Amino acid sequence: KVLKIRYPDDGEWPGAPIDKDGDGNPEFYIEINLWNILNATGFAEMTYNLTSGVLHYVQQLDNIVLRDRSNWVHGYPEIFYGNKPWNANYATDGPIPLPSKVSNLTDFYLTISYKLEPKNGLPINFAIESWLTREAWRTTGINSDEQEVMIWIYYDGLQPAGSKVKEIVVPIIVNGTPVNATFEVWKANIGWEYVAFRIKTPIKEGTVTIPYGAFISVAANISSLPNYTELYLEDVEIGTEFGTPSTTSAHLEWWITNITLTPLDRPLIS
Ligand SMILES: OC[C@H]1O[C@@H](O[C@H]2[C@H](O)[C@@H](O)[C@H](O[C@H]3[C@H](O)[C@@H](O)[C@H](O[C@H]4[C@H](O)[C@@H](O)[C@H](O)O[C@@H]4CO)O[C@@H]3CO)O[C@@H]2CO)[C@H](O)[C@@H](O)[C@@H]1O
Ligand SMILES: [Ca+2]
Ligand SMILES: [Ca+2]
């Protein structure tokens, strides 16, 4: 009834599928994803109640030493839908068929209910991201002619990679009320093209719905990549990146109670 993964007990790379009907196709996949920590004292644990659907993350890390300080952040504990292109983990039991080419995909709303509790000023975000790859089912990383798109709906103490490009309006729903929100658009070249959308009014807790194609359309429009609409939207990842190279302790708790992808009857890109 409860799935639990724990670092370092389960190794340096704990993760697991959420497969509530036991049908061998996960609905979501969870990873502690401390991808830039070489060593730390303490623990991180992610637990998922299969009946309530609550995902609860508890992290108490100290003495943190990074694998490569140029990566900046320490990790990105997360839950995702689709095929994460950095490894062989996937989740495809859901209404949106990911991966799909961006030219063939419907737009969709993403709704998340959550609450974040970083401790003592830990730098952090709550970031949704997708990878856009040239092949349909990538599992071995990302090339220079591909894109990473992130959407930050909370942040404290972190800035996206690269340079600020512009600000856009995106109509979103926050705590049941439709609102016009502003996102800063950032672009970088970090081994691949990176585009990030950082909300100007961070939301630390509640229920937020965003229209995914508002973001992908802007990422396509500002892209320097050729043949953008032939890329595959591999996945939708939701997690909290945390830490900086001068962060040595990172205590954080959060909860996610619902994630829903709702198809729209319109193209993803407009
Ligand atoms: O060899 C040990 C172990 O490796 C596992 O594979 C690791 C790769 O080694 C590691 O490079 C990869 O890290 C990814 C990570 O999964 C992504 O979440 C992260 O995304 C970053 C993004 O790169 C940034 O630009 C943006 O700002 O932040 C996001 C979120 O922080 O990117 C890094 C790549 O740099 O993770 C793999 C595991 O998922 C093997 O799978 C295992 O078998 C080996 O034992
Ligand atoms: Ca399933
Ligand atoms: Ca994968």
Side-chain angles (χ1 to χ4, degrees), residues 1-240 242-270:
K1 21 161 60 290
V2 176
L3 169 65
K4 178 187 293 277
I5 56 173
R6 183 178 169 112
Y7 175 100
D9 306 49
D10 294 329
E12 287 180 9
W13 302 93
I18 289 170
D19 183 14
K20 179 165 173 44
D21 62 346
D23 80 342
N25 190 4
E27 301 86 57
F28 292 96
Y29 198 99
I30 59 170
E31 299 182 358
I32 291 181
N33 196 31
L34 301 178
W35 62 267
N36 195 36
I37 291 186
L38 180 75
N39 189 76
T41 60
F43 70 93
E45 182 165 281
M46 196 183 297
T47 300
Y48 181 74
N49 185 303
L50 279 138
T51 302
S52 69
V54 173
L55 183 68
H56 180 191
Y57 183 62
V58 178
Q59 177 186 292
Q60 302 183 7
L61 296 165
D62 294 274
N63 298 281
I64 296 164
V65 175
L66 302 185
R67 299 179 189 286
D68 179 350
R69 293 169 66 275
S70 75
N71 289 145
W72 195 259
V73 298
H74 296 199
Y76 177 58
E78 63 175 299
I79 179 165
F80 70 83
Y81 178 73
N83 167 45
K84 178 166 170 182
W86 291 97
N87 59 44
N89 302 331
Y90 64 91
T92 68
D93 189 351
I96 307 306
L98 300 184
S100 283
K101 298 172 192 197
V102 293
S103 67
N104 290 353
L105 249 174
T106 186
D107 201 1
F108 57 97
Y109 285 128
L110 175 65
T111 304
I112 307 165
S113 294
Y114 64 95
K115 178 176 191 352
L116 311 170
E117 288 189 354
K119 293 336 153 10
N120 293 329
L122 175 61
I124 192 161
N125 65 27
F126 188 48
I128 300 145
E129 73 166 342
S130 295
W131 302 88
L132 289 92
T133 53
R134 291 285 173 203
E135 72 176 300
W137 190 274
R138 172 68 52 69
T139 59
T140 52
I142 299 291
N143 299 326
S144 66
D145 69 332
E146 289 171 343
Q147 202 183 57
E148 183 184 6
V149 177
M150 319 189 84
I151 306 155
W152 304 6
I153 62 175
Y154 183 76
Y155 77 95
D156 181 29
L158 291 175
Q159 176 173 291
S163 297
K164 184 178 167 187
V165 178
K166 63 178 172 178
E167 292 189 5
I168 65 167
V169 180
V170 180
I172 66 173
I173 314 175
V174 180
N175 297 335
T177 300
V179 294
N180 285 328
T182 301
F183 287 80
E184 297 183 344
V185 183
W186 292 69
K187 181 174 172 186
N189 287 299
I190 58 170
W192 52 86
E193 185 179 80
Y194 167 98
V195 174
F197 298 90
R198 183 174 69 171
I199 205 174
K200 287 201 78 124
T201 50
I203 303 162
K204 199 178 180 187
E205 65 181 308
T207 297
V208 176
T209 296
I210 69 174
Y212 217 73
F215 301 94
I216 302 303
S217 295
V218 173
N221 179 250
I222 73 166
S223 182
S224 301
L225 297 175
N227 302 314
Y228 184 96
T229 63
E230 298 182 359
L231 293 164
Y232 289 84
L233 189 84
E234 293 287 273
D235 68 347
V236 176
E237 308 187 31
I238 297 163
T240 56
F242 72 87
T244 73
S246 68
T247 306
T248 58
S249 285
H251 287 222
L252 168 59
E253 188 166 18
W254 54 245
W255 301 257
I256 298 175
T257 61
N258 193 10
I259 298 167
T260 303
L261 288 69
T262 305
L264 295 167
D265 212 60
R266 74 187 178 209
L268 182 71
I269 283 169
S270 53

